[PDB]
Design a protein around this ligand. Sequence first.
Ligand SMILES: *[C@@H]1O[C@H](CO)[C@@H](O[C@@H]2O[C@H](CO)[C@@H](O[C@@H]3O[C@H](CO)[C@@H](O)[C@H](O)[C@@H]3O)[C@H](O)[C@H]2NC(C)=O)[C@H](O)[C@H]1NC(C)=O
Ligand SMILES: *[C@@H]1O[C@H](CO)[C@@H](O[C@@H]2O[C@H](CO)[C@@H](O[C@@H]3O[C@H](CO)[C@@H](O)[C@H](O)[C@@H]3O)[C@H](O)[C@H]2NC(C)=O)[C@H](O)[C@H]1NC(C)=O
Ligand SMILES: *[C@@H]1O[C@H](CO)[C@@H](O[C@@H]2O[C@H](CO)[C@@H](O[C@@H]3O[C@H](CO)[C@@H](O)[C@H](O)[C@@H]3O)[C@H](O)[C@H]2NC(C)=O)[C@H](O)[C@H]1NC(C)=O
Ligand SMILES: *[C@@H]1O[C@H](CO)[C@@H](O[C@@H]2O[C@H](CO)[C@@H](O)[C@H](O)[C@H]2NC(C)=O)[C@H](O)[C@H]1NC(C)=O
Ligand SMILES: *[C@@H]1O[C@H](CO)[C@@H](O[C@@H]2O[C@H](CO)[C@@H](O)[C@H](O)[C@H]2NC(C)=O)[C@H](O)[C@H]1NC(C)=O
Ligand SMILES: *[C@@H]1O[C@H](CO)[C@@H](O[C@@H]2O[C@H](CO)[C@@H](O)[C@H](O)[C@H]2NC(C)=O)[C@H](O)[C@H]1NC(C)=O
Ligand code: NAG
Ligand code: NAG
Ligand code: NAG
Lengths: 324, 324, 324, 176, 176, 176
Amino acid sequence: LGSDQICIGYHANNSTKQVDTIMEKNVTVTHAQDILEKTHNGKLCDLNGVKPLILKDCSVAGWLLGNPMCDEFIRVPEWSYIVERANPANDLCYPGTLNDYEELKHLLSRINHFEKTLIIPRSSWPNHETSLGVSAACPYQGASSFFRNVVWLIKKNDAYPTIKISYNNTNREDLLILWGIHHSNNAAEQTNLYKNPDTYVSVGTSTLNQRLVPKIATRSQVNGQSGRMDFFWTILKPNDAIHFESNGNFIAPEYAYKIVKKGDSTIMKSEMEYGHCNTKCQTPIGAINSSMPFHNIHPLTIGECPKYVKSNKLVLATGLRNSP
Amino acid sequence: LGSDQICIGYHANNSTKQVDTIMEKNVTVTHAQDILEKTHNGKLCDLNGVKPLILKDCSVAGWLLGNPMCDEFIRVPEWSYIVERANPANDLCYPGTLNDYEELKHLLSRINHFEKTLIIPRSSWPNHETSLGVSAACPYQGASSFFRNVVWLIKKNDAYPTIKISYNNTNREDLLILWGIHHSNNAAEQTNLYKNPDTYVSVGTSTLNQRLVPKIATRSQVNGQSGRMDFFWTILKPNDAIHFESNGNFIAPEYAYKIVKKGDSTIMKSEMEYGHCNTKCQTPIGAINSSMPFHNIHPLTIGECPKYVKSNKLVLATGLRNSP
Amino acid sequence: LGSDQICIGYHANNSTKQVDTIMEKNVTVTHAQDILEKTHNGKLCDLNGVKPLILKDCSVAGWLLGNPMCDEFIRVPEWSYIVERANPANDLCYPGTLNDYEELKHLLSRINHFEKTLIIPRSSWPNHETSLGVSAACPYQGASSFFRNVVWLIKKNDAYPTIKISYNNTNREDLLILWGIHHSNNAAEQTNLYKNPDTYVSVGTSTLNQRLVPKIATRSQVNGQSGRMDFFWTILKPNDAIHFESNGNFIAPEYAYKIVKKGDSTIMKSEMEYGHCNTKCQTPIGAINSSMPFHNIHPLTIGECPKYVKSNKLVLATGLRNSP
Amino acid sequence: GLFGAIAGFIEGGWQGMVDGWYGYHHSNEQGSGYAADKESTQKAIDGVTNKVNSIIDKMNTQFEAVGREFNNLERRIENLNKKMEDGFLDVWTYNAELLVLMENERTLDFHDSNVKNLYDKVRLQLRDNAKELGNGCFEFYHKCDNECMESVRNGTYDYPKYSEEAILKREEISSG
Amino acid sequence: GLFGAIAGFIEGGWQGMVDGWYGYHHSNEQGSGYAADKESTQKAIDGVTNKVNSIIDKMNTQFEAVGREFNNLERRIENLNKKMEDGFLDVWTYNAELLVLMENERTLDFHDSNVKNLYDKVRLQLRDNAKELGNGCFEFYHKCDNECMESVRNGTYDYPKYSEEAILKREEISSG
Amino acid sequence: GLFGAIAGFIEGGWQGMVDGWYGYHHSNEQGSGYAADKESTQKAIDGVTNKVNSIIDKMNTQFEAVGREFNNLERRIENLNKKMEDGFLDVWTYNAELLVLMENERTLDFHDSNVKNLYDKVRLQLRDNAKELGNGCFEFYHKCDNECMESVRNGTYDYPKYSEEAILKREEISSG
Ligand SMILES: *[C@@H]1O[C@H](CO)[C@@H](O[C@@H]2O[C@H](CO)[C@@H](O[C@@H]3O[C@H](CO)[C@@H](O)[C@H](O)[C@@H]3O)[C@H](O)[C@H]2NC(C)=O)[C@H](O)[C@H]1NC(C)=O
Ligand SMILES: *[C@@H]1O[C@H](CO)[C@@H](O[C@@H]2O[C@H](CO)[C@@H](O[C@@H]3O[C@H](CO)[C@@H](O)[C@H](O)[C@@H]3O)[C@H](O)[C@H]2NC(C)=O)[C@H](O)[C@H]1NC(C)=O
Ligand SMILES: *[C@@H]1O[C@H](CO)[C@@H](O[C@@H]2O[C@H](CO)[C@@H](O[C@@H]3O[C@H](CO)[C@@H](O)[C@H](O)[C@@H]3O)[C@H](O)[C@H]2NC(C)=O)[C@H](O)[C@H]1NC(C)=O
Ligand SMILES: *[C@@H]1O[C@H](CO)[C@@H](O[C@@H]2O[C@H](CO)[C@@H](O)[C@H](O)[C@H]2NC(C)=O)[C@H](O)[C@H]1NC(C)=O
Ligand SMILES: *[C@@H]1O[C@H](CO)[C@@H](O[C@@H]2O[C@H](CO)[C@@H](O)[C@H](O)[C@H]2NC(C)=O)[C@H](O)[C@H]1NC(C)=O
Ligand SMILES: *[C@@H]1O[C@H](CO)[C@@H](O[C@@H]2O[C@H](CO)[C@@H](O)[C@H](O)[C@H]2NC(C)=O)[C@H](O)[C@H]1NC(C)=O
Ligand SMILES: *[C@@H]1O[C@H](CO)[C@@H](O)[C@H](O)[C@H]1NC(C)=O
Ligand SMILES: *[C@@H]1O[C@H](CO)[C@@H](O)[C@H](O)[C@H]1NC(C)=O
Ligand SMILES: *[C@@H]1O[C@H](CO)[C@@H](O)[C@H](O)[C@H]1NC(C)=O
């Protein structure tokens, strides 16, 4: 009816999405975009197509030394990370110690090939007693036994002749070897078990030069045992040899492990179980799949992850101010 | 006389405050605002309502072992952080060593409850001599004495019978225990003090398994003493027991400390004294009270602080350009 | 022909330089400016006018102990950083060990003054044999010899009388001292070399209190030697004295080094050679001279450097959009 | 900040314009309707999604990772890791929050400028041929049909054509 | 950057305007005086203090702390801590210096846009009823009393009212 | 973002203007030519190089440095250093990439505003003495020689002088 018109304007829609701005808060807008990743799948997954090593009720130590309840094993022989329960129930059945445990675990966190092999058989201790090295602390089928991958040698007849043995690694691969020494409780036990009262365990490679001596003393019971067993380890390079010598208290290797390492990783503490998935970024409460630059799920990631922040939203405006 | 007018304009004032800008420097402006915190109160304060433990002329070690000049003590029994002088004069009166000292100090930096208790009394060494374990290195009222919380046992008659004692922690609380061993200087001193020439000190808990042996050798005098005393410590969990055995050179616990830890902190080096204030953020040269996001006072903060920078000003413009 | 005109405009040129913008890519522009430093001179240089210590085919250890192929030395006596080859060929000729090696290297990375001095001469071992402490592992002029700065003492006549010697540092300067102990292979070698079968090495200062005992055991050959030599070090403060005692297996100091430290640095691994230049910022593949705030040459810098990034360009626009 | 007007001299937005982000609403005797500035909208859609993608793509250093491996007598070293971990979290947290805030301010006034640049394209084409109502509209002095309406929408309006019919309607409005 | 004019087409600010940040100076036969745009000044006071508060409040991760605990044979680890401590200081130092610089540039041209948007609010209300002197003032063709002066200060000026009186004063200035 | 026009109402730049960054092209009967706004170009050269210098100079904490010193049984500690090293590289890398992007956006629209502020300086000097062609040019209604041309280039153009000569040419273009 009146004069003709043309207006300039801009669109608007039903969006309730809000955004903030250095100068203004809670500004409604056409379209927006959260760049903060907030979701995970609730699962333990492979890491770039490699399954992790999930010890169930075992510690790395229990697993390696072959605690009788960990040899529910058969595996692996390759993994991207390790996952332990917070308090795995089967650690060192016979109480004691594994030297440089933490560094060992780190070394073992991501392994490219791993294989148990018989290194010195139980039938190469003709003058010592192999089958009596057993304990109620460390039981299997109701019968009491011991770490399966190592041998608690005791005296035969009334003698413990001095052991001088050596093993040459003739494999392509580095190999990881564990032995130990037993700390007895008093003069009687040490004689009863080993005859000789003043004993040692010495170990040499091209690198290693150790000599261990049992501390005979009184300690409080752990798993009903005041005795104590300290273990040690080394990586015997190909074509090197390890040299053992002992006149008592020796906990001798039977099996050892072939290892090849090329890559680092770490140990995850989580109560979950394998979820038959795959991810680039794993957390203890679940895996994250995104290209978003930040996340807020969990700080202990392993993988290639967005950057962890204390934030609930990172909302970027793409549209315009939206009026009523 | 002429036509009517109306101008649009903006204000200005006598402000000399200057600001910088990516494209321009030294630009005068109406109002501004430094966001860089630059002041502190010059005082050592409580940290969220908890007094720190200010050792005056004592080291943590002197304090714990009860160096005769540190037992001018009466305290505490709770603290948020510890402050030491740079070179506290009363450390180890009798020269030596405290094992894992640095880790121990860290453990003790913030403590929720701390209480000295008599753990084994001097009247439970009937066959040894308690009151002769004393030294000119380590004097009190001009008379020479020794660390008050531990006992330098020596031979009685011409004998040092072998000690086998144990103590069971029957308290609710973890407790921190210290003992030591004495390194004598030659065969004569060792016989003179302990009779037996070849001696040891062994110590066991459910966790600990140590055996110490004195190094009898020649060392340069410190506080006029070539002898040396090495101390050690453990945290005995409730219901565990510690087991001591020694035929010589034993520096035995008398007192121990109940501890409950829930929180971490650290050790501040500062020459100041308690200022009867409270703060959220403490530095060695004074406490800072602000909500400003950056500061430049001092890098060794303890508390919840702004972020340290190398800067003298962070001035934000709020007003407009101010003209002549 | 038509009316007069005046246009407002802006310039343009034949620049092809491109720039990016949060909202636009590959935008051509008049002038631009890379703020990412991408070049280095390909040389190992002095660091603020101080030449680095470039061990050629020697390790720090070989160099300090005076391995017969490292005493191609004459130097230094000041340096800003050290550069080692990745695998220097002359380390420990006689196989073994240098304790706290890594910390020692760190201490020595930047040294303000360094000077070898005769501390105890070979002609002060009248009752022991100095010139027979020699090995094929460790040859010089085709003749077999030994670390030059230390002395492998062996028995004289059929005796190794107990050594009690001491040295007082009477210099202005701290001094760095090294000694060692020899681990023999069996009862025969030990008797053949030292007579006494049960030996020790004890060492004391005001600070140090050590006692070393040889492990007599079987080890695999390295440089054709199953024997093993462990070395140790200390910094003897001015006016303090070091006290040695041993009845066998002692590798005794002859020379020691005066040191003054005031500044920290580190160890560079590089295969390059001195380029007779000077820089503020050195990398293992060359030195960088710039005031640019970022670089991408190499992460292992030593000096005052720009900040390392994963980036190929950081191009800032200075000009305007350049049209066709 | 604000260029002339989004929520300024242009009170609100066309709920009914659905073919773009910025455009024009006309009315004449032939009818009325919305029509988006296709070309102008595409510029902004590109700029904006380019902004978001840059913020994502430049992170392009994610790397590799871990948790918690020191023991009960390595508390000092663990505390060092804590400090580092916390320190980075504080840095990334602040940078992201401010990035978002700052970049939203700039996204909104980007839209503002785009619109104001359109008002101005039109304003400089008509002039005394129409009244600047000042609410973002123009009241034509002459009569402007749909073929004419499109000629301003595409920057080809013919001033010399109607500058006459207009002069005439100004001499009508300055009288009864 | 610069919008039209703070130190542009408006050399200088009203030393005498003391009730706000942006406003108007008039002169007519009743007198002359300054009067701030209350509403427009409050917008800016809000935006600016909102900026400052955001810069402060988003840090909202302060955390917890320490000094210096490694010993004489742990120099390597201490150096690690040095590098970390220095590294954060370098990062926070740079981010803060540039934040301040960049955000000051933008605070100043914010004020610029606020003023220019005011010139434009007034300009689009009067038109041929006043001359754009171009120094930031308007010379009225008609006579504008204080009740009139306030009617432009609050966006309710009545164009259709005074057109009458103005066209007449243009035909006076183009003659004797 | 875009102020009126760089690649807006002024398609393209003067390949032939070589004495500055912004300026004027004239044509009259005496001839035609380019001439840069010396004063306006220097402002921008100063602002821009000040920006670059600030980005450099504020880093002003470079500090001091190292490589790789932990051994085969100190892998945990080395991994701590790795994380730290990588962490700082991720932070600096992102902050630099975005700084560049953001600051380039702003450098370009700085130039845009500078130009538009020049159009406006000239526009507010002439008025009804010239036609706003809307492509960035002004068609003089009167005749403007080189002495006149320079008088606008330096902000001393004499409006009261050429009125009428213009009013006269408007009454010629509105007739046949
Ligand atoms: C573990 O066993 C292997 C093999 O039995 C040892 O390596 C072998 O070392 C010999 C010499 O020590 C190598 O020599 C080769 O033959 C003759 C020997 O007279 C020599 O003259 C030649 O020049 C040639 O190199 C031999 O290649 C090598 N064998 C293999 C299969 O690698 C190794 O030393 C043993 N480890 C220890 C600690 O004994
Ligand atoms: C340190 O403290 C106590 C000594 O009182 C020891 O724990 C206590 O052990 C007794 C038996 O050894 C527990 O006895 C309880 O009642 C009967 C009576 O002997 C017994 O047959 C039951 O088996 C039952 O457990 C008693 O519960 C327990 N006390 C507490 C408060 O837990 C403890 O073993 C000593 N620690 C060490 C390391 O020696
Ligand atoms: C290592 O050697 C130095 C001397 O070469 C020792 O320091 C010196 O100690 C002597 C006394 O032992 C000081 O004697 C001075 O002379 C007069 C003479 O009667 C005396 O009355 C003064 O009171 C004064 O003490 C001498 O000044 C001092 N000199 C220096 C440079 O220290 C040092 O104690 C020796 N350290 C060891 C561990 O043997
Ligand atoms: C811009 O607008 C004009 C408005 O008329 C368009 O002109 C019409 O274009 C169509 C399709 O080519 C013709 O069939 C009509 O007859 C035209 N009408 C008139 C009056 O010219 C023009 O096409 C538009 N230009 C562009 C490039 O899209
Ligand atoms: C907005 O401006 C107008 C004009 O100055 C004001 O209108 C006057 O209001 C008073 C008070 O109610 C009346 O008595 C006058 O007659 C009005 N004057 C005119 C010229 O119409 C109005 O008050 C202003 N509003 C505010 C809130 O200040
Ligand atoms: C701005 O331009 C004008 C010309 O438009 C310059 O005026 C000339 O100045 C001198 C005085 O020394 C006279 O002799 C010339 O005749 C003037 N020209 C005209 C047309 O009158 C003026 O110098 C310039 N201003 C500045 C500050 O550079
Ligand atoms: C992760 O999500 C992306 C798209 O965001 C998808 O392409 C991909 O299939 C998902 N990954 C897995 C393992 O399913
Ligand atoms: C800190 O200073 C503020 C003012 O800046 C003051 O209000 C407050 O009371 C002070 N805090 C304490 C704990 O004394
Ligand atoms: C850095 O480069 C400049 C040349 O632009 C030169 O003057 C200076 O000497 C260089 N510095 C070094 C240490 O080579």
